[PDB]
């Protein structure tokens, strides 16, 4: 009983709004149905590997923080801090920003409206969700349970219908690698786009830490759950490629929306695209929930310059709203400057820079402190953490060399925190 319940959490937290929007960048970079469809498989394998390795350090440090504390505990207060600065300035705000744009993009697509009203709607949705979160967890949690229930209905309904489309079969995935989109250069632009749909697997640390006596069955739940997601993501892509194809999917910034309007001609496609807008909305809301945590955890130490104001938790709601206000504004900077794929690629390149440090950290720990209590230990010890790091190195090396400008905004904004760190370690906040 216990296991199945957790399993749900894995499936739940991983499944996002990615499948509904990312195929555009996936097949847009791959230029062939078969290359794209493998990027969805490799990303899933990369994250099962990443998941099982991170659960070890998650169990060595049972706490709801993670990477801020996984990395402080092996690399030092400085690396522990950087991840927070990165999460507060880049990762949470751009996730809010990207999904707010894609939400509004899909809003404009469904209610046929101007392609200028993307950005005003992206501001207002992010402004509205920050407000609703400052009201409390009454309304945020109301959105979340509604989002988690309804986000699975469009998928089942797309898989059944898509896999039964009349112009449908293996032939609908036949170009595997097209020479117009070279294999190795394009696969890295595709994997960085499939990974954003697997976003949220990172919280396996906080999950493993949270289990008492995990061991037998904690790895079953990480493998079983993420491979359910992986299977679901491969199935919906075959369904997409049955209706549309490589060049066609890249042709709209809303790929799943088009597939819906083919599979069900009428109001049926509306109920499916509504379901998609709920999936994206619930994303933004759920990112804010998790977002507020970081600037406050920084403010809990010296880490931020206005630590007094950042750490203020309002006695009516029990939340640090002030942290999220800085995050809201820098998301607005990002909604007005980048586009949805520019932002998804930031997020992957940046967080995967730190995610990798955490994998190496498990191996480091095995020699630093082999006698520390390990409630759970990574199975097939050297192999799988090394897999995670092999592909982890691949993504960071490729996005640098593919997107020099987008990688530099991640390198730049992370290192802007180094002057911030030595100011606030001497002055302690304000």
């Amino acid at each position, epitope marked *: 009983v216990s296991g199945i319940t957790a399993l749900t959490v894995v499936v739940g937290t991983v499944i996002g709004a990615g499948i509904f929007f990312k195929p555009t960048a996936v097949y847009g970079a791959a230029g062939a149905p078969g290359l794209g469809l493998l990027a969805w498989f490799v990303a899933g394998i990369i994250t099962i590997a990443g998941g099982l390795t991170v659960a070890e350090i998650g169990t060595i440090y049972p706490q709801t*923080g993670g990477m801020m*504390i996984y990395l402080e505990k092996v690399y030092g207060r400085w690396l522990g801090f950087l991840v927070g600065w990165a999460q507060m300035v880049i990762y949470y705000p751009a996730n809010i920003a990207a999904l707010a744009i894609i939400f509004a993009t899909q809003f404009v697509n469904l209610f046929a409206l101007s392609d200028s009203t993307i950005v005003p709607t992206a501001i207002l949705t992010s402004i509205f969700l920050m407000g609703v979160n400052f009201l409390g967890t009454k309304y945020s949690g109301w959105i979340q349970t509604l989002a988690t229930i309804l986000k699975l209905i469009p998928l089942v309904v797309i898989i059944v219908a898509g896999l039964l489309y009349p112009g449908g079969g293996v032939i609908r995935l036949v170009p595997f690698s097209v020479e117009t989109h070279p294999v190795l250069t394009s696969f890295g632009s595709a994997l960085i786009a499939t990974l954003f749909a697997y976003d949220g697997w990172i919280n396996v640390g906080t999950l493993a830490g949270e289990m008492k006596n995990p061991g037998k069955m904690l790895p079953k739940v990480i493998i079983g759950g993420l491979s359910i997601v992986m299977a679901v993501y491969l199935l919906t892509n075959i369904a997409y490629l049955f209706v549309l194809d490589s060049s066609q999917l890249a042709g709209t910034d809303t790929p799943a929306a088009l597939v819906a309007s083919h599979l069900f001609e009428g109001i049926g496609s509306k109920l499916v695209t509504i379901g998609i807008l709920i999936s994206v909305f619930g994303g933004i809301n759920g990112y804010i929930i998790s977002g507020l945590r970081v600037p406050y955890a920084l403010a809990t130490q010296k880490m931020l310059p206005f*630590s007094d104001w950042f750490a203020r*938790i309002n*006695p009516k709601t029990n939340l640090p709203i002030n942290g999220g206000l800085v995050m809201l504004g820098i998301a607005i900077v990002m909604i007005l400057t980048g586009q949805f794929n520019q932002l998804t690629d930031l997020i992957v390149f940046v967080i995967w820079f730190f995610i990798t440090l955490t994998f190496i950290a498990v191996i480091i720990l095995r020699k630093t402190q082999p006698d520390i209590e390990r409630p759970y230990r990574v199975p097939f010890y050297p192999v799988i953490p090394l897999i995670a790091i092999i592909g982890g190195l691949y993504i960071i090396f490729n996005t640098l060399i593919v997107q020099p400008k987008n990688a530099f905004i991640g390198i730049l904004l992370t290192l802007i925190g180094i002057p911030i760190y030595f100011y606030c370690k001497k002055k302690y906040g304000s």
Partner: nanobody
Amino acid sequence: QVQLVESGGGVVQAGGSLRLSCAASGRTFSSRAMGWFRQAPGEGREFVATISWSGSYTEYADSVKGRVTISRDNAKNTVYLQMNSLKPGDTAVYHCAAKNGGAASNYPNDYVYWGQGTQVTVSS
């Protein structure tokens, strides 16, 4: 289902010491992580310390690290907070809090069960 009572607060001298203790309803205590939070008269909640179910992981805030220590006796279903070399800026109602799951937390909203709190006044 998880009732909490804090003990050990009161008037102390600056530089003095104080052991807060928080008794809990038992049943689930050993499978739950605990926290110490404080509330100054002019403010909301402030994170002090937290602890894993087992006690393997502990975490204290910047303003109290080194001076304070959090511990638990899962047999006695109690969590302790040994404060030393106190300062007049520790003066607050120290609340004790329980959450679901064995992972520690600096985030107050994680915690579902809260104690009524015990007054600590530090002064010269």
